Amino acid sequence: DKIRILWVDDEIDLLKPHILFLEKKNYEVTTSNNGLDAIALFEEENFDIVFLDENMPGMSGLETLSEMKEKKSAIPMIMITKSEEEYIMEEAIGSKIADYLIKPVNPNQILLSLKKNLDDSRLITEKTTLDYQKEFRKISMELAMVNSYEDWVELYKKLLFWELKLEDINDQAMIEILESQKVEANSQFGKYIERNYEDWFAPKADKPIQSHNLFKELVVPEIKKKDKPILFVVIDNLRYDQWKSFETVISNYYKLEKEVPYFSILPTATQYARNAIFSGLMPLDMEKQFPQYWKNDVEDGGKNLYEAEFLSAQIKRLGLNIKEDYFKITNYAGGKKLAENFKALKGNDLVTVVYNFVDMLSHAKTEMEVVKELASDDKAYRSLTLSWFKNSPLLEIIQQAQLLGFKLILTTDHGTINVKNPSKVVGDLNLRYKTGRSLTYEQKDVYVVKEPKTIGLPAINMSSSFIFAKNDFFLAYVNNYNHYVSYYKNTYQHGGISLEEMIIPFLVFNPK
Amino acid sequence: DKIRILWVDDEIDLLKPHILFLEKKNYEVTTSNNGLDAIALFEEENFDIVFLDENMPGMSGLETLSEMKEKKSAIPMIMITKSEEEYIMEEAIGSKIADYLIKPVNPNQILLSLKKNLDDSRLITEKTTLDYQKEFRKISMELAMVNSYEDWVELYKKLLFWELKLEDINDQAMIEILESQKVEANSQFGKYIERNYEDWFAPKADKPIQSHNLFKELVVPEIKKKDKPILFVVIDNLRYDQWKSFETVISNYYKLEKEVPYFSILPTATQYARNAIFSGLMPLDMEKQFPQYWKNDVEDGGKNLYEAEFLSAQIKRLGLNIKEDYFKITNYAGGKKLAENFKALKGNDLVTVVYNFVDMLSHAKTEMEVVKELASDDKAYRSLTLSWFKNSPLLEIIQQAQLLGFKLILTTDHGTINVKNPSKVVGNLRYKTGRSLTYEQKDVYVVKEPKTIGLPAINMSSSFIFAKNDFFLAYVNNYNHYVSYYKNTYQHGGISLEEMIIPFLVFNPK
Ligand SMILES: [Mg+2]
Ligand SMILES: [Mg+2]
Ligand SMILES: [Zn+2]
Ligand SMILES: [Zn+2]
Ligand SMILES: [Zn+2]
Ligand SMILES: [Zn+2]
């Protein structure tokens, strides 16, 4: 019932006030004056934590710790010693010491170390649970008052902060409260976009940075600095909560210098948003200025085959004379090949890398039972994304760029949303947007644009219209309605309006 | 270069010796005497770490911490304060403080905290690399001296310990040395099994616990204790290293009482090993005693459809009068359904649950490009398995059993191995049974009389071959296509530490 401590020190008799203090706090303390006797004790009994002196006659604390870690690696071990040498600090940290306390140590410092190493996950759960109970009413109130794109960014950031904090907590009732705030936030954001989207295209409108502005406004100033070559990575289909899931992994190689949440253009689909990043033009202007590259929905083949050409035309148009190359990664083998030969690009000013894995992974949830279990909810999907990133050729490419002193620019073209509710469409395959001459649809469920050219979109031919699903709706054809509902319900789809699909990260980092 | 520190304290002028000490160690220090001014600086500038006083006029150190974590949650924050109250310690730990130092603080204690929070992964990499450099020759020596099944279990445990230890090191030479020891271990283990396997079937032989002995020897004594209902989970195709990857997750709900590494029977395939768990009979005895349930390789349909029937016959045969139920989970929906209705099984003595996800996931890497990237190497596969377990209906079922005070028995039928080298065959990629097989003798353990190792046979013509090492049996007819497609895939059925030495775990709910 009591927490058992094994304390190893050659002068353990001189530390009796610490033992008495800890026994008052309900800790059980077992002492040892030599590393070898402590190892025998540790093998016979089940201690919750070990305290070790470094400098002892015979076996050192680091030698003793090494034998105990081999026998029970999950038991935390703390160094409490007079040793102040940095090389001893480094050897102990490197040996996975849970803490290092320099003598004379305050008995409350030992107590802090005990609480931090043994009760932290419980304390974090209780603190987060209590903090959210006191915060949710203020979130709902802030949600009701959001009336601008900057307030939407801040509200989305607040929801994302509580989502990653609450994912681990036991309280299902509170998890459901946050989920209701998320669906209400998406309901208000879809009406905000319906209401202001077209106005953003008017001359000198107050609008956020969008897909077609991204390269000129945020990448070009980094290039003009001319201090470091740039690795510009566009991870297709990266939700903001997916970046937050691997932010601390990337911090081991890159120090975040700038973060700019930006808005993807509509539709939040690759063919439109990703090509607009590389060309710096709206789809209607890409059709007008580059008919040889732009492809409308009705044309067969790949919709993003000419991004290098679009990018080189944008770079030339902006007056830059740089050494730049484009790579599109569609599979493991290609990612690995680019990671292995990255040094060949050392002399480049810009290296653009499109990485498709996360988009293919989001769509695999529709097609594969194994991905349905791996990404059953938003928490599972974040966990799966973090597992991917940590073991990906993309991280190996990022590590190669860090070794060459490259600045890292990490961004995406759009996010994706788990669709839950069907919405009947009649048209002529994307579940969150549809374009065509005579579309039949539910007015309340979609943002309708009857003149696509007003929002920089090509009109296939004069009576063409664009509909964009709002909330968690999926556009389902009446033709085989029950089969579309059954198959596409609870799958990740992008193309329409939501915080997940539209508000996306633009990140700049310096190598460390 | 230079690590940037933001230090917030109302008595920041009294801390100048600490600042000068840190500046000498190449740290850049920015000071602030109030939490609100520190929040303004923290938003405008990119600091690597923040030091905060708890008691300040105006915003407290915990109120300031809370604003700073909301703005940039990835930056470590340390509290440096005179407060010694346990409730302040708890509120700070609960707020995800990286460290908490009580004033008067030794300047070297701050330096330790800086090194531990900012350089630990690099220091751990360097220390682990050197520890393995000084250990690898002793591992090779131990490997050469292994001459028993118990020494194999201990050597496998040692290799698994270093595999997890090394999984993030950069030193290619060391990574290759470990890999070489793993291939050499499977080589020696294959020779050890090729000798010893048949002898283990002789009366009163010194043999390890196998598939057909598992239930009677290790589950039945737990049932005979009679002071907790048992949830018996068989996760199909669970490598020892996959159990080691989620061991600390399961420790949040269950305390490990007993661990018994056991040996799967040959072939290390579900049809044989998993049915032998549930029947407590070798496949040849399952064919003889239950012809209505046992299915040979040539019969179409599911090969593990009658495990509840086999289990109930074993339980009846062992003299047990228990309330028992069997569940086979083949998909997410069924797993979720069992988690949702677990309480209906509260009054049971035994609840057996077969969980197929990990086997389906190992096979998905062969075909799906997305799974090739998620499980490209052994480290990625462990990471993927840990991501799965943490968010699985299986863990929800385990949590439901913990709430009901059930004892947990966690085991598997076999592991799997990443195959790398082809081996020609004519007539599963790790075992083959048939009448008159053509094969490479050096690459397989050959049993020309399958009944001698408790396996079925049709006249003296049929035999079984079991791939050793990382070999995969590729048909001569379509050789180049089999090699190209199945190279670097997870396959089970043959002999390896990964396939054969598997965990049997007993836990008490906490
Ligand atoms: Mg000493
Ligand atoms: Mg103060
Ligand atoms: Zn895309
Ligand atoms: Zn997509
Ligand atoms: Zn199996
Ligand atoms: Zn299998």
Numbering used by the authors:
A (entry chain A): 2 to 429, 434 to 517
B (entry chain B): 2 to 428, 435 to 517
Publication excerpt:
The type IX secretion system (T9SS) is a large multi-protein transenvelope complex distributed into the Bacteroidetes phylum and responsible for the secretion of proteins involved in pathogenesis, carbohydrate utilization or gliding motility. In Porphyromonas gingivalis, the two-component system PorY sensor and response regulator PorX participate to T9SS gene regulation. Here, we present the crystal structure of PorXFj, the Flavobacterium johnsoniae PorX homolog. As for PorX, the PorXFj structure is comprised of a CheY-like N-terminal domain and an alkaline phosphatase-like C-terminal domain separated by a three-helix bundle central domain.
In this study we produced and purified the F. johnsoniae PorX homolog (Fjoh_2906, called hereafter PorXFj) and solved its structure by X-ray crystallography at 2.0 Å resolution. Similarly to the recently released P. gingivalis PorXPg structure, PorXFj displays three distinct domains: a N-terminal CheY-like RD (residues 2–121), followed by a three-helix bundle domain (HBD, residues 122–205), and a C-terminal PglZ domain (residues 206–517). Two PorXFj molecules are present in the asymmetric unit. While not activated and monomeric in solution, PorXFj crystallized as a dimer identical to active PorX. The dimer is stabilized by a network of electrostatic interactions (21 hydrogen bonds and 6 salt bridges), as well as hydrophobic patches (involving 21 hydrophobic residues from each monomer), principally between the N- and C-terminal domain of each monomer. The putative binding site of the metal supposed to stabilize the phosphoryl group is clearly occupied by an ion that is octahedrally coordinated by the carboxylate oxygens of D11 and D54, the main chain-carbonyl oxygen of N56 and three water molecules. By comparison with the PorXPg structure, and accordingly to the coordination number and the bond lengths between the ion and its ligands, a Mg2+ ion was modelled in the structure. Despite the absence of BeF3 that mimics the activating phosphorylation of the RD, the side chains of the two PorXFj highly conserved ‘switch’ residues T82 and Y101 are oriented towards the active site, in a conformation corresponding to the active state of RDs. The active site coordinates two Zn2+ ions: Zn1 is coordinated by the catalytic T271, D237, D414 and H415 residues while Zn2 is coordinated by residues H364, H499, D360 and a water molecule. In contrast, the two monomers of the PorXFj dimer adopt the HH conformation with two coordinated Zn2+ ions and are therefore likely to be active.
